[PDB]
Amino acid sequence: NFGAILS
Amino acid sequence: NFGAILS
Amino acid sequence: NFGAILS
Amino acid sequence: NFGAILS
Amino acid sequence: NFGAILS
Amino acid sequence: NFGAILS
Amino acid sequence: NFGAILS
Amino acid sequence: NFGAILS
Amino acid sequence: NFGAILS
Amino acid sequence: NFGAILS
Amino acid sequence: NFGAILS
Amino acid sequence: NFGAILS
After folding, report:
1. A5: number of Cβ within 10 Å
2. Min CA distance, H7 vs chain E (Å)?
3. Is E4 in contact with G4 (Cβ distance < 8 A)?
4. Rounded to whole angstroms, what are the CA distances from A1 to A5, B6, J5?
5. H2 in helix, strand or coil?
6. Distance from CA of J7 to the nearest CA of A (A)
């Protein structure tokens, strides 16, 4: 899978 | 701010 | 899924 | 202000 | 879902 | 003032 | 003033 | 879920 | 102010 | 999952 | 602020 | 898996 977080 | 995605 | 919060 | 979304 | 508050 | 929405 | 939201 | 408080 | 999200 | 808090 | 993701 | 924290 994949994932991300942005500030 | 904050944004996230997770598959 | 995905999600976000804005100030 | 504040805004949010969550799937 | 989603939601918000405004001052 | 104040305004709100919640789904 | 004060405003709040909680899902 | 999500939530916020404003002064 | 304060805002939060938790999936 | 994911999560965030904003001041 | 603080943001996190964990798969 | 994967994970992250942002300040």
Report:
1. 20
2. 9
3. no
4. 14, 8, 25
5. strand
6. 13
